[PDB]
């Protein structure tokens, strides 16, 4: 099994391939646990987690862009919202939506795997579609 | 915070696979792959999916395409979109407590998959595909 085989590959297969360099793969995964709080340090959002695809556990960080899109607010927008109660109330709403979305997250994750640090960055999230179903049928020779 | 997880990953399985292929016992569950001519898989943690057909406090019974399974301890797991009512399609991460007459899990997470029906279309194929790629 190829690391480019659609619709997704497996972490256990990635690790067994013993990659020397940082490697992009797409896996279907959920968050087993978060491993830190949401952080805005550095001027950007980050949060660490352990995900599983059913074949392995993987420490990951999520990119700012993903967390901005779940919350509805960038770090600058969050800071600006502290300047006005009505806007800050909207950020709190966005934060609850994000917390919930991380709890329920189960999707295709494009991840950048650093084999030296045994961890990865999640670059993008994608929901499954009928093409994914068709690719899985084709891979199972059906 | 300082977290602690099952030693092994949540393997994707179907109810019938537990019901009929599991052996060993509490705390030493293993799944037979004698049919596919391969060695036992270790079975603490699982990833299972189904339609909720019964909900009662923190227990649920769920139906996947192969059969029913139970889940205990849902009052303890993270609450996302509420989905512990009949009709919801959900995933469960759990630990295997019994395999027959009816598979039973201790719940670690349960999360809603209802808002995209394509999860349900894919699930049985996912189980099969994952099983093919474990040596």
């Amino acid at each position: 099994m190829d690391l480019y085989s659609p619709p997704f590959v497996y972490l256990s297969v990635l690790m067994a391939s013993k990659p020397k360099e940082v490697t992009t793969v797409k896996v279907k995964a959920f968050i087993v646990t978060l491993t830190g709080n949401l952080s805005s340090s550095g001027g950007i959002w980050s949060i660490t987690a352990k995900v599983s695809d059913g074949t392995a556990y993987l420490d990951v960080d999520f990119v700012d862009e993903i967390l901005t899109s779940l919350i509805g607010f960038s770090v600058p927008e969050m800071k600006q919202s502290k300047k006005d109660p009505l806007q800050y109330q909207k950020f709190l709403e966005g934060l609850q939506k994000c917390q919930r979305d991380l709890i329920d997250l189960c999707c295709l994750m494009t991840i950048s795997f650093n084999p030296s640090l045994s961890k990865a960055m999640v670059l993008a999230l994608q929901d499954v579609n009928m093409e994914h179903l068709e690719n899985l049928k084709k891979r199972l020779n059906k | 915070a300082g977290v602690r997880l099952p030693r092994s990953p949540p393997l994707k399985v179907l109810a019938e696979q537990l019901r009929r292929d599991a052996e060993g016992g509490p705390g030493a569950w293993r799944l037979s792959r004698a049919a596919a001519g391969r060695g036992p898989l270790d079975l603490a943690a699982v990833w299972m999916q189904g339609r909720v057909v019964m909900a009662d406090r923190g227990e649920a019974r769920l139906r996947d395409p192969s059969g029913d399974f139970s889940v205990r301890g849902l009052e303890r797991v993270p609450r996302g979109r509420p989905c512990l009512v009949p009709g919801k399609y959900v995933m469960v991460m759990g630990v295997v407590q019994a395999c027959s007459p009816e598979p039973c899990l201790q719940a670690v997470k349960m999360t809603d998959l209802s808002d995209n029906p394509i999860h349900e279309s894919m699930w049985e194929l996912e189980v099969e595909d994952l099983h093919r790629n474990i040596p």
């Binding site: 968050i31 087993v32 646990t33 978060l34 491993t35 709080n37 917390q99 991380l102 709890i103 | 915070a1 300082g2 977290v3 602690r4 997880l5 099952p6 301890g73 303890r76 797991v77 993270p78 630990v95 201790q106 719940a107 670690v108 997470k109």
Partner: peptide
């Protein structure tokens, strides 16, 4: 077992 999602979750092992 223990998970964290903005609060701790204690589960039986």
């Amino acid at each position: 077992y223990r998970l964290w999602f903005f609060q701790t979750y204690k589960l039986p092992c």
